[PDB]
Amino acid sequence: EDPQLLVRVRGGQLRGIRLKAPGGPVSAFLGIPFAEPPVGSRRFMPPEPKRPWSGVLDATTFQNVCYQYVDTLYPGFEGTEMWNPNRELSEDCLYLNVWTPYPRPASPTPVLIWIYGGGFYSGAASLDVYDGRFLAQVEGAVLVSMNYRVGTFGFLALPGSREAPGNVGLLDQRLALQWVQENIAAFGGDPMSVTLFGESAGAASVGMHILSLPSRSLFHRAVLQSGTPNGPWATVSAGEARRRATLLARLVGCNDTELIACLRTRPAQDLVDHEWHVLPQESIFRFSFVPVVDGDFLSDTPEALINTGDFQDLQVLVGVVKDEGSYFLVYGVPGFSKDNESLISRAQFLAGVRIGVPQASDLAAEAVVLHYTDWLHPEDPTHLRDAMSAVVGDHNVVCPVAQLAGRLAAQGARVYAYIFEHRASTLTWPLWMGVPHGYEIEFIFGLPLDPSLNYTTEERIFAQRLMKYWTNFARTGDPNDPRDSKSPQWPPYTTAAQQYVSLNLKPLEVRRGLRAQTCAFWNRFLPKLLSAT
Amino acid sequence: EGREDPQLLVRVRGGQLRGIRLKAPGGPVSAFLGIPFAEPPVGSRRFMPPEPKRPWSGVLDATTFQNVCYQYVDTLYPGFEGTEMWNPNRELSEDCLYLNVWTPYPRPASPTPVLIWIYGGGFYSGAASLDVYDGRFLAQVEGAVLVSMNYRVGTFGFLALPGSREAPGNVGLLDQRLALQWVQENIAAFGGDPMSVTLFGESAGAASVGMHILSLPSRSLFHRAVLQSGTPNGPWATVSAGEARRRATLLARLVGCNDTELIACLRTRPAQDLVDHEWHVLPQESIFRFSFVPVVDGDFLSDTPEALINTGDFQDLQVLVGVVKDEGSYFLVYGVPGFSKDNESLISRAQFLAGVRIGVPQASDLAAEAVVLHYTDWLHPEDPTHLRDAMSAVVGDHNVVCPVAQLAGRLAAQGARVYAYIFEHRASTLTWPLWMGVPHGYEIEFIFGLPLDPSLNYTTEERIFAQRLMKYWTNFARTGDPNDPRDSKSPQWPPYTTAAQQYVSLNLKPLEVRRGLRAQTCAFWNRFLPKLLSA
């Protein structure tokens, strides 16, 4: 019975497990319950604190993955399977994971809290790419990650009702953050230095914690990788949420109370089976059950809240990968596949656009096409393919990120921005997809430090750089290495200079303007257009 | 005759002419100036189609430029050479339908390709007698036969009550066509070849050339065409029948005047009173808009130029078209607040938003918004230097560069052989400020070879440059190809095509080939803006 692996938290005692990281051991406490299982009459409801337990809770293994749709586009393909659940599905899934240095930090160590992505309909804290042992061993970080409910279980809402108020998946995250405040000191973590980071919908979640008052006392700094609370996919209105719920109810054979009671009797997979059938249009990068503007968790739209908020007290790191959109094309756009070069025609490009920008009027869709067409080579299939990706990536991630960065900087926040440009040597998706959505994560978490993974030595050096930026940001709100003159420095993003850095194998290079012209089109012009036409 | 220079006596259909022997740098040329080609369109003939000049008796003296057509005189910067060079240099008169001929001296042996110049001036001004249009250099150095004609401008040339008998519209264009007919009948008397006639013109002259291309009756009067910084399509070169009617009747009201009675009253007004009110009938505060221009009458112009270029067959057409580096700059000082020739015209973002409304006068709020969004530099949305240059670009792109791109594009896609250029050399003698770059109209003096005149103070490179340009233009006139057959060592000027979109830079350096005539931005003006109009 190793005393390092024994911890007492408010709920009782836990036993962790000593894990091996390439350069030493780490203590891991996996599958720790932070809420009462949200099952039965608790489905769709806010989470409740876990009841205390007797004896020593076994925390040596990952708990179940929250019930969710499982990707079947390319069965058995590593590129898709790496995001698929790697433990049993169950509605009983509200557990978190802690990694710390072995032995446990002598002084209170900055805490990093990871919130996974997966479009709010999927994901799990137990995936290999979220392995916290590297950051724990190399950087001496305390790293936390929670499961939170996704899809219907996490975001189905009949706004105003008592039994499906919406946003309970975000309340799961918040409960887990509360748990960190109350318990993390027992592991050596410093509750007074907590940094949230997350990718895609996890980044959007981080963004919503920034914009929700009760969350603000649970962390001090934030990192948003390739996702934002503002933008086209991360939220829905009360009315559109209500619409999607009652439609799903109808689809599975079901006054709010009675509607929800009948939904509560449905086996989990019955709900998932119809999840994708409630979207208003044929689309990509669009998800049926996501956070809802309830006037509660989110008092107004994220757009409104970032425009009017005071962010003086906030430090943020935000960024995008080089090819945000490519991934999503093979999930809905005719002409695209991981198996060929997806060279498309002009007609297929105009088709792709109505799908990639599903809420666009005819005129707006024409605007997009004409903006993104290269008029020197209007019909070149290679350009058209790359343009289709750019449209999807720009509309859904890059421009929403440029918008957020700008509002935050303009309203007092300390902001750092990046674009991640290195394509992993181990990547299984075709070359034409470039650096796809989500493929910076394995580098931030430091997976290349594991020799059995076959990353190149330059990549291993790269990963170490990124872990430094992230953990330095966690420690100080500034990703710059304090023990390093010469670099050059990573400057804050401001509305004046608009500086950000490229992250890749070469040293930091400072650039200005994050797709400035193109994001002016999306952020300034298109709104004016659609609100008229 | 008896003791006159026997080489200067010529007979044309209307009678005998005596020309004058002029000195050009490299030798003498023959000039026949102020030849009448129409009955004076005065009195009851105001607003009417021209009638062919009736024969005269004796020897008409043709040694001096004739009257300039009655027009507005520019007074923005009185005494300033930059404006005065474009002002009338002979007496104003409604009796102004005369043309000019320069030829080698002695006149050519075999029949020589003919160049016909059509001056610009917004359809409200201009004259064939200006210094920058001096035909002596092309005649002497290239052996060209050069013809230029006066044509009515302003109300006199373009006031229209469409459908009426007394003011049918486009009479200024019919003056041009009458002069083309005169060339067909008479130019062989000077050694000119009526079967090789190339039209060239700049600004409204260029738009005029484009309208002769689109007008069937003019099509048997010429064989090749050059359009410099102007097009028959675009926002300023034509008005609708309704808009012309509206402007004519408003102008009538302003001067105290059933179409017949209205026009009859207009014919009693002194020329100057019409000129004094012509700017007052424009629909909005604007620049690069002119009150009385060609009208889509369904006669001379069977449909809008846009419709005609979109659907015409242009197999038989050889055309040279181009633009200067800074088409819009000149126009800014004539009405965009913040702009002047006498300072750097650094402007604010607010002055930019206002300038856009004036420079794109027909835009709705949303459309103006699109323009401001597109042209703003979003790394430096507030920089006064960038904003100044963007304002100029907005005006140049909207009025010239994108209409020319559209024209070259449709003509090529539909059979025509098209050559395209951008002219980038700023004259060492320019009197406009540096901020204006290479302004609208300032290639003309190079095409006509003025830098060959030692007394004008051009540099030796400019002289050599002028000679190259004169070669391109005359080669194109001779063969429909600007390239020199002998000289293959010199870089070649490829045709412009929809597939490759190639065009050349004209400057002190050897031809450089480029692709895409503001392709992205012109996609905005030519493909998107019109649709933002169906909404």
Side-chain angles (χ1 to χ4, degrees), chain A residues 363 366-367 370-378 495-498 512-514 516-517 520-521 524-525 528-529 532-533, chain B residues 366 369-370 373-381 498-501 515-517 519-520 523-524 527-528 531-532 534-535:
Chain A
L363 179 51
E366 194 55 43
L370 305 181
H371 178 92
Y372 277 88
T373 295
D374 183 338
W375 290 103
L376 286 153
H377 318 102
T495 68
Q498 304 179 52
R512 293 177 59 163
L514 193 54
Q517 291 308 111
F521 171 74
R524 290 172 201 261
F525 179 71
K528 286 173 189 300
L529 177 54
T533 316
Chain B
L366 179 57
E369 202 48 43
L373 272 270
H374 184 88
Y375 279 86
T376 287
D377 168 12
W378 292 101
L379 273 180
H380 303 99
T498 70
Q501 304 182 55
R515 294 182 73 252
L517 224 329
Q520 284 313 111
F524 168 74
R527 296 166 187 273
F528 177 71
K531 302 211 158 210
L532 190 50
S534 316

Side-chain angles (χ1 to χ4, degrees), chain B residues 84-415:
Chain B
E84 294 298 342
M85 59 181 299
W86 310 103
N87 280 338
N89 65 331
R90 292 298 180 264
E91 182 180 333
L92 298 189
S93 172
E94 289 183 84
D95 176 3
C96 67
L97 298 190
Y98 298 88
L99 58 72
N100 313 297
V101 178
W102 289 265
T103 72
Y105 178 113
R107 306 193 299 274
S110 50
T112 313
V114 177
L115 285 179
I116 298 174
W117 176 252
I118 308 186
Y119 58 75
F123 291 114
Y124 76 83
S125 58
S129 58
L130 307 183
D131 283 5
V132 288
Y133 310 146
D134 193 336
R136 75 181 69 202
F137 309 101
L138 280 160
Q140 203 288 323
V141 178
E142 295 294 337
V145 171
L146 204 147
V147 182
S148 60
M149 88 289 283
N150 284 354
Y151 62 95
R152 285 170 283 175
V153 295
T155 54
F156 314 94
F158 298 96
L159 185 141
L161 290 160
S164 82
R165 202 206 97 253
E166 308 87 343
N170 304 321
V171 310
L173 287 174
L174 296 174
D175 298 339
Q176 300 174 8
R177 169 185 291 162
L178 181 45
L180 307 192
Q181 291 172 333
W182 188 99
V183 165
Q184 284 298 296
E185 174 156 29
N186 298 291
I187 204 63
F190 300 82
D193 179 6
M195 283 175 54
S196 184
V197 172
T198 301
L199 309 185
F200 73 136
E202 182 273 348
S203 189
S208 301
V209 167
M211 281 165 208
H212 288 299
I213 296 178
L214 306 171
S215 196
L216 178 63
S218 292
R219 280 253 46 198
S220 68
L221 309 174
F222 69 101
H223 320 275
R224 278 170 296 286
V226 184
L227 289 77
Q228 311 173 200
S229 299
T231 60
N233 54 298
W236 56 267
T238 62
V239 288
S240 68
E243 176 61 8
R245 178 160 286 279
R246 193 218 131 231
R247 299 174 186 192
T249 112
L250 181 47
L251 170 98
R253 286 213 277 113
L254 301 171
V255 298
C257 279
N258 168 240
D259 288 351
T260 297
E261 306 171 58
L262 196 163
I263 296 157
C265 172
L266 281 181
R267 291 194 312 264
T268 73
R269 292 300 168 258
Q272 192 66 55
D273 292 351
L274 304 189
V275 174
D276 285 2
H277 291 91
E278 80 165 275
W279 294 98
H280 305 316
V281 309
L282 285 170
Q284 313 89 189
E285 194 185 344
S286 56
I287 55 172
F288 221 130
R289 295 294 184 267
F290 316 106
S291 285
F292 298 98
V293 307
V295 57
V296 179
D297 52 355
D299 181 12
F300 193 109
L301 283 182
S302 63
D303 201 343
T304 66
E306 193 195 16
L308 297 178
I309 73 176
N310 279 357
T311 76
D313 180 18
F314 301 102
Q315 303 167 177
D316 299 320
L317 187 61
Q318 290 154 141
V319 79
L320 169 61
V321 300
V323 297
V324 297
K325 195 174 109 277
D326 308 83
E327 292 287 351
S329 67
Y330 205 131
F331 297 87
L332 303 189
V333 303
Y334 286 86
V336 183
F339 292 84
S340 169
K341 87 181 184 61
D342 295 316
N343 70 47
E344 305 310 307
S345 313
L346 298 190
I347 58 152
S348 61
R349 180 148 192 93
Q351 295 175 301
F352 180 63
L353 308 190
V356 170
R357 298 327 290 275
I358 300 169
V360 192
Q362 276 73 67
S364 63
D365 283 22
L366 179 57
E369 202 48 43
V371 173
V372 161
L373 272 270
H374 184 88
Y375 279 86
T376 287
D377 168 12
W378 292 101
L379 273 180
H380 303 99
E382 300 290 61
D383 186 75
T385 294
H386 168 78
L387 291 166
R388 174 247 266 161
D389 295 347
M391 188 65 256
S392 167
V394 166
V395 167
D397 291 346
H398 177 50
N399 292 297
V400 178
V401 184
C402 293
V404 166
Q406 179 66 15
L407 179 69
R410 301 315 286 237
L411 265 30
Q414 291 157 217

Side-chain angles (χ1 to χ4, degrees), chain A residues 214-482 484-513:
Chain A
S215 283
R216 292 293 306 265
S217 62
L218 309 175
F219 66 104
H220 320 277
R221 284 174 285 291
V223 184
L224 292 76
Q225 310 167 208
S226 296
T228 57
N230 54 294
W233 54 267
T235 59
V236 289
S237 64
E240 174 67 356
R242 172 168 288 286
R243 183 215 138 230
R244 296 175 184 200
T246 100
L247 176 50
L248 175 93
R250 168 203 189 258
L251 285 184
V252 298
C254 292
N255 170 266
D256 290 340
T257 297
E258 297 145 15
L259 184 144
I260 299 158
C262 172
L263 282 177
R264 290 212 254 262
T265 78
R266 289 295 186 278
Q269 184 68 27
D270 288 3
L271 268 28
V272 172
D273 278 348
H274 287 290
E275 201 185 301
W276 291 105
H277 298 148
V278 301
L279 290 167
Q281 297 90 194
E282 183 190 0
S283 47
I284 51 165
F285 219 129
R286 218 105 307 181
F287 318 109
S288 304
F289 299 97
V290 305
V292 53
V293 186
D294 57 347
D296 187 7
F297 196 101
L298 296 177
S299 63
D300 207 331
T301 61
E303 163 150 290
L305 296 178
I306 73 180
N307 286 351
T308 76
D310 172 35
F311 299 104
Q312 281 299 351
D313 285 324
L314 183 61
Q315 301 112 25
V316 229
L317 165 65
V318 303
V320 299
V321 301
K322 185 174 137 289
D323 298 285
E324 292 288 350
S326 64
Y327 199 121
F328 299 83
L329 301 180
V330 312
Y331 282 89
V333 184
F336 292 84
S337 153
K338 76 177 194 66
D339 289 320
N340 61 44
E341 285 174 6
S342 322
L343 299 179
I344 57 164
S345 71
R346 182 144 188 96
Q348 291 178 303
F349 174 54
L350 321 190
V353 163
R354 317 300 316 253
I355 293 182
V357 192
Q359 282 75 77
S361 64
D362 284 336
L363 179 51
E366 194 55 43
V368 173
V369 175
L370 305 181
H371 178 92
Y372 277 88
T373 295
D374 183 338
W375 290 103
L376 286 153
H377 318 102
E379 312 217 69
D380 174 46
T382 294
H383 284 282
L384 293 171
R385 171 250 268 158
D386 289 352
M388 189 63 230
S389 170
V391 168
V392 164
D394 287 348
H395 170 52
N396 290 301
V397 180
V398 185
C399 293
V401 160
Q403 170 100 311
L404 176 69
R407 301 311 300 220
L408 297 189
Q411 296 151 220
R414 192 163 192 63
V415 183
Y416 295 91
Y418 68 80
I419 183 184
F420 183 94
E421 289 181 327
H422 179 70
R423 174 175 164 110
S425 56
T426 57
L427 196 72
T428 59
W429 296 95
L431 278 169
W432 74 259
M433 283 188 162
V435 184
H437 187 72
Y439 292 88
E440 87 277 24
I441 298 168
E442 65 204 52
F443 292 94
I444 312 288
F445 273 85
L447 264 68
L449 276 56
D450 178 358
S452 65
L453 290 173
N454 297 331
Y455 287 97
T456 78
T457 180
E458 310 89 62
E459 275 171 340
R460 190 255 305 172
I461 283 156
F462 188 37
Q464 308 193 250
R465 278 176 58 212
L466 303 178
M467 294 169 74
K468 263 291 161 203
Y469 292 140
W470 263 240
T471 54
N472 280 328
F473 177 79
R475 284 178 282 253
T476 63
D478 185 337
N480 288 288
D481 207 335
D484 170 67
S485 165
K486 204 61 94 69
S487 23
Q489 301 289 284
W490 186 338
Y493 179 93
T494 61
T495 68
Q498 304 179 52
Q499 303 170 292
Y500 63 104
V501 304
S502 52
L503 302 177
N504 59 35
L505 293 189
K506 317 186 306 182
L508 278 193
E509 144 186 332
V510 183
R511 296 178 195 167
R512 293 177 59 163

Side-chain angles (χ1 to χ4, degrees), chain A residues 39-326:
Chain A
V39 306
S41 82
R42 273 289 138 175
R43 184 189 269 180
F44 314 123
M45 296 275 63
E48 307 180 304
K50 174 75 173 71
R51 289 173 312 116
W53 61 84
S54 66
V56 180
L57 194 44
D58 165 43
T60 71
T61 192
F62 280 124
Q63 270 283 357
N64 296 318
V65 166
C66 291
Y67 212 91
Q68 70 191 238
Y69 175 84
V70 167
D71 190 50
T72 51
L73 180 55
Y74 299 103
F77 171 58
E78 190 61 8
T80 40
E81 293 294 346
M82 59 178 298
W83 309 107
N84 273 331
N86 68 337
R87 290 309 191 266
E88 296 293 326
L89 306 196
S90 163
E91 289 177 74
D92 178 354
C93 62
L94 295 188
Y95 301 88
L96 54 78
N97 312 300
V98 177
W99 289 263
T100 82
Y102 184 100
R104 88 181 54 158
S107 45
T109 308
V111 183
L112 284 85
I113 306 182
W114 176 254
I115 307 180
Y116 57 74
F120 288 115
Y121 75 83
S122 60
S126 59
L127 305 179
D128 295 350
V129 288
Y130 311 147
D131 194 331
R133 79 223 280 156
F134 304 106
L135 283 159
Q137 207 287 304
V138 180
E139 288 296 343
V142 175
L143 197 147
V144 180
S145 61
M146 84 291 286
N147 279 356
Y148 62 91
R149 287 173 282 170
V150 295
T152 57
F153 314 95
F155 301 93
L156 179 140
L158 291 171
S161 73
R162 196 221 95 212
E163 41 279 305
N167 295 338
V168 305
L170 293 169
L171 293 173
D172 295 348
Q173 302 175 5
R174 167 179 294 164
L175 181 58
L177 268 37
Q178 272 156 0
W179 186 96
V180 168
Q181 285 300 295
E182 294 163 3
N183 293 297
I184 205 52
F187 301 79
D190 182 2
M192 289 191 305
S193 177
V194 169
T195 301
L196 313 183
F197 67 139
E199 188 267 352
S200 204
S205 298
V206 171
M208 287 160 208
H209 291 290
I210 287 167
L211 299 175
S212 192
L213 181 57
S215 283
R216 292 293 306 265
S217 62
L218 309 175
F219 66 104
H220 320 277
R221 284 174 285 291
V223 184
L224 292 76
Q225 310 167 208
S226 296
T228 57
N230 54 294
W233 54 267
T235 59
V236 289
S237 64
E240 174 67 356
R242 172 168 288 286
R243 183 215 138 230
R244 296 175 184 200
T246 100
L247 176 50
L248 175 93
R250 168 203 189 258
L251 285 184
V252 298
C254 292
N255 170 266
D256 290 340
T257 297
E258 297 145 15
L259 184 144
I260 299 158
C262 172
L263 282 177
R264 290 212 254 262
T265 78
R266 289 295 186 278
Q269 184 68 27
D270 288 3
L271 268 28
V272 172
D273 278 348
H274 287 290
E275 201 185 301
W276 291 105
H277 298 148
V278 301
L279 290 167
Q281 297 90 194
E282 183 190 0
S283 47
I284 51 165
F285 219 129
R286 218 105 307 181
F287 318 109
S288 304
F289 299 97
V290 305
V292 53
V293 186
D294 57 347
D296 187 7
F297 196 101
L298 296 177
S299 63
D300 207 331
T301 61
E303 163 150 290
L305 296 178
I306 73 180
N307 286 351
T308 76
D310 172 35
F311 299 104
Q312 281 299 351
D313 285 324
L314 183 61
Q315 301 112 25
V316 229
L317 165 65
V318 303
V320 299
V321 301
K322 185 174 137 289
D323 298 285
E324 292 288 350
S326 64

